[PDB]
RNA sequence: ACGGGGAAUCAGGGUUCGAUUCCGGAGAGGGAGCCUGAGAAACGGCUACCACAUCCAAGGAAGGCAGCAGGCGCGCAAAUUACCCACUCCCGACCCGGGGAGGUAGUGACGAAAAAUAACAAUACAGGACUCUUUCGAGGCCCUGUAAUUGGAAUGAGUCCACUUUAAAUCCUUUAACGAGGAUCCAUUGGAGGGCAAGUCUGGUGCCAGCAGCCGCGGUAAUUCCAGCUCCAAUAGCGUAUAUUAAAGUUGCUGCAGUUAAAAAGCUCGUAGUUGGAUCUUGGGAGCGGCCGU
């Protein structure tokens, strides 16, 4: 601190209260602008509808096709590109399927190669994409 | 462009069937197997150490 | 090989009950039944085998001790005066009803619909 | 509104750094020396130490001739000597800070079974307790984490319903007897 | 955004949460108005209006689960239309009646505790403290190790007479006889370049497929992909996502920084605000233990 006077409690408290807004992560969680424009609206998972399967071009030196899926959520109708992870798991997903879309890892940030893909697919219509990949369960049709 | 070569490798790598192995002892029994490997058998090794999974 | 050692003995002159906590030491057999319990309480305190009401046993881990609660009364005319209705049902001197509350409550609410003496005819 | 307890706490805390090379060495070295089932079983005894230990920090930093510290402190001292961990002359509350994890684990009945010669190894001792062979003051102890008290040490032998003590044969000793005269005549 | 008791985290300070069982308050679809009564602006009371919705012979009439179950809807997100007044109790005109309040079960990996999945010999044999021999070697006083070699011992899971338990069952405990040798009565979930414990092993793929929190790997020797063995970590658990705490001395009261990295208003005045010089009570007697201490 700077001002140390014994009767300077309201200034030292109120100055922090103002300068705490200049903290990035405070203002993301105290203005509702991030909470508004969070595509899930503060959920860890969200169910949506696969309307198109889109193969995203990997960014810098890593030259590869990142097989993602454009999903439209139930609660919002706000449209989301969700990266389908494992080796040959886009072939479990088809048009107008229900998919449980989780966050990617970095709390609404693009992770690794994939540009602007802030979400990933976990379940493929009540059957998990791990159980389909390991072949412990099958996809209903 | 092309979402056409999805699962190219995993698809056409020749599947080796998982091998019949002796069932590993579980619970305190593993730690007995794990302890008596580490600090009751072995000797001071001149030069730098080998890893437990050091195949050479 | 059974040994009863009665604990915390009290006399209620205001319920007519000599009541004790019964330390049964049975090695190598199961929690001995209330039929085999009370027949030892008869010649433990020179008591008649009617007025002895014993319940709520808890076998200690191992198989060598149960410490449940029982009470011995003055007479059976007092035994009906001051008893749970289920602890008279084990010995067979309080024959309970056999119709449950799902029947009674819907019988009660159909009676609640009729004003007059026509309540007699609604249920059954 | 329902008449239940809910009051439950955690008996261990996991280490912050998960893969310290030398730390994983010691916690594995404690297992073989005392026959424990998992690193959980090591972590809780370090935390029972840490609870006891942290009470001393709250007591040594108090005033002297203090109406709390002399009662509060001399009951912790009374706890640690009865369990057989701390000494009878060194039950002044300075010596609880010089008091390590290996002090508690010898009072573990898993080891008391081993260190009276009524087991063969410390792993065998767990098979005697968890398959209920033993009693302490005529009560069958089924669990190896029985913190044996100082006076309660002289009573540890086999249970009265055990073939390894004074009782009837188990299952296996009867099946060779089942095959014995069953085929003979 | 019900409020507090509290909760999580936590060197010390803090930060964050408190819908939720205890207290106080508010509300019964939204408002409003009342009756009765000691007490209500009552909703398992009424009268409206508004929204919604039910039966109907079209005239009418009845309604309020943010009680307990259940059902639909919404969702990432949540249990039985079960039993009982035996317990805690409350009401009544009452020893008797009643109570989804409450209790007991079903469901339940929200979570917390305890804690199985082997143990012990037997000889092969691999070494080790050691009498002996320079070693190659035997003894073996101490056992130390592992294994589809051979055994005699175990208890639990499971099956189930029988009590016990409790209102009546249940579950645990207790109890029989039946119950373990690939004890198939088969522990997983994640990793194995670095951070970060753990393979320059092989086979495939060849900027592809994919991995990868970050750094990055993959261009035909891939420690990173996909597989085989392998081993590492935690263990009836473990991985992922999201909020949040410590990490953060990267919100700094403790405790940061502003010359050049982000940053001192162009400069001065100035009322709130904050902070403000030294200065007025000292020393003596006296009781006292081993010059000092009370």
Do C110 and C123 form a contact (C-beta atoms < 8 A)? Answer: yes
| Measured distance between the N- and C-terminal CA atoms of chain D, rounded to whole angstroms | 69
CA–CA separation, A110 vs A80, rounded Å? Answer: 13
- Confirm or reject contact between D159 and chain C (CB < 8 A): yes
Q: Are strands C66-73 and C52-55 parallel, antiparallel or unpaired?
A: antiparallel
- What is the number of domains present in chain A? 1
> How many CB atoms lie under 10 A from the CB of residue D82?
14
Do A119 and A103 form a contact (C-beta atoms < 8 A)? Answer: yes
Interface test with C, best of D141, D161, D170 (most C CBs within 10 A): D161
CA–CA separation, D146 vs A82, rounded Å? Answer: 53
Calculate the angstrom distance between C1' of E282 and CA of D62. 37
- Which tokens hold the place of B38? 């580490």
Q: What are phi and psi of C81, to 5 degrees?
A: -65, -30
C-alpha distances (whole Å) from D154 to each of A56, D134, D141, D160 are 74, 13, 15, 16
Environment class of D182 (CB within 10 Å of its CB; exposed 0-12, middle 13-18, buried 19+) = exposed
Do D32 and B36 form a contact (C-beta atoms < 8 A)? Answer: yes
Q: Is D30 in a helix, a strand, or coil?
A: helix
Q: Are strands A98-103 and A65-73 parallel, antiparallel or unpaired?
A: unpaired
- Which tokens hold the place of D116? 């009276």
- C113 lies in which domain range? 1-124
Do A132 and A94 form a contact (C-beta atoms < 8 A)? Answer: no
Resolution of the coordinates in A?
3.1
**Nucleotide lying nearest to C66, CA to C1' measure:** E174
What angle (nearest 5°) sits at the alpha carbon of residue D39, between those of residues D35 and D45? 80
- What is the number of domains present in chain C? 1
Residues 42-71 of A with CB under 8 A from B: 53-55, 65, 67
- Confirm or reject contact between C30 and chain D (CB < 8 A): no
Measured to protein CB atoms, the chain E nucleotides within 7 Å are 21-22, 74-77, 82-88, 98-104, 111-121, 127, 144-148, 152-156, 161-168, 173-176, 178-180, 182-184, 186-187, 190, 192, 196-201, 203-205, 207-219, 225-236, 240-244, 250-258, 273-276
- Confirm or reject contact between D37 and chain B (CB < 8 A): yes
């Amino acid at each position: 601190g700077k001002c140390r006077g014994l009767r300077t409690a309201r200034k030292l408290r109120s100055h922090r209260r103002d300068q705490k807004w200049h903290d990035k992560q405070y203002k993301k969680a105290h203005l509702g602008t991030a909470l508004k424009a969070n595509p899930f609206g503060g959920a860890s998972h969200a169910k949506g509808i696969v309307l198109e399967k889109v193969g995203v071009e990997a960014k810098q030196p890593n030259s590869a096709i990142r097989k993602c899926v454009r999903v439209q959520l139930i609660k919002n109708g706000k449209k989301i590109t969700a990266f389908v992870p494992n080796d040959g798991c886009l072939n479990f997903i088809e048009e107008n399927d229900e998919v449980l879309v989780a966050g990617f890892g970095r709390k609404g940030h693009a992770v690794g190669d994939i540009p602007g893909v802030r979400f990933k697919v976990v379940k493929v219509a009540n059957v998990s994409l791990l159980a389909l990949y390991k072949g412990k369960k099958e996809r209903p049709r | 462009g092309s979402l056409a070569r999805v699962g190219k490798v995993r698809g056409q790598t020749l599947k080796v069937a998982k091998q019949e192995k002796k069932k590993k002892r579980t619970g305190r029994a593993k730690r007995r197997m794990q302890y008596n490997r580490r600090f009751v058998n072995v000797v001071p090794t001149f030069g730098k150490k080998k890893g437990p999974n050091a195949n050479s | 090989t059974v040994t009863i050692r009665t604990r915390k003995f009290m006399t209620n002159r205001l319920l007519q009950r000599k009541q004790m906590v019964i330390d049964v030491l049975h090695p190598g057999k199961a929690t001995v039944p209330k039929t085999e319990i009370r027949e030892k309480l008869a010649k433990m305190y020179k008591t008649t085998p009617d007025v002895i009401f014993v319940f709520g046993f808890r076998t200690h881990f191992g198989g060598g001790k149960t410490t449940g609660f029982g009470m011995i009364y003055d007479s059976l005319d007092y035994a009906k005066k001051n008893e749970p209705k289920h602890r008279l049902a084990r010995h067979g001197l309080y024959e309970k009803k056999k119709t449950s509350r799902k029947q009674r409550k819907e019988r009660k609410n159909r009676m609640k619909k009729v004003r007059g003496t026509a309540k007699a005819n609604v249920g059954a | 509104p329902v008449a239940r307890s809910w009051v439950c706490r955690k008996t261990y805390v996991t280490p912050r750094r998960p893969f310290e090379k030398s730390r994983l060495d010691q916690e594995l070295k404690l297992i073989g020396e005392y026959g424990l089932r998992n690193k959980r079983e090591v972590w809780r005894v370090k935390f029972t130490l840490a609870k006891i230990r942290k009470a001393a920090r709250e007591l040594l930093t108090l005033d002297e001739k203090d109406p709390r510290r002399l009662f509060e402190g001399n009951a912790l001292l009374r706890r640690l000597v009865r369990i057989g961990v701390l000494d009878e002359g060194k039950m002044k509350l300075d010596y609880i800070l010089g008091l390590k994890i290996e002090d508690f684990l010898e009072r573990r009945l898993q080891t008391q079974v081993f260190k009276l010669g009524l087991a063969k190894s410390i792993h065998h001792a767990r098979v005697l307790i968890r398959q209920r062979h033993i009693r302490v003051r005529k009560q069958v102890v089924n669990i190896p984490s029985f913190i044996v008290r100082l006076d309660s040490q002289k009573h540890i032998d086999f249970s009265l319903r055990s073939p390894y003590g004074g009782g009837r044969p188990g299952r296996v000793k009867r099946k060779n007897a089942k095959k014995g005269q069953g085929g003979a005549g």
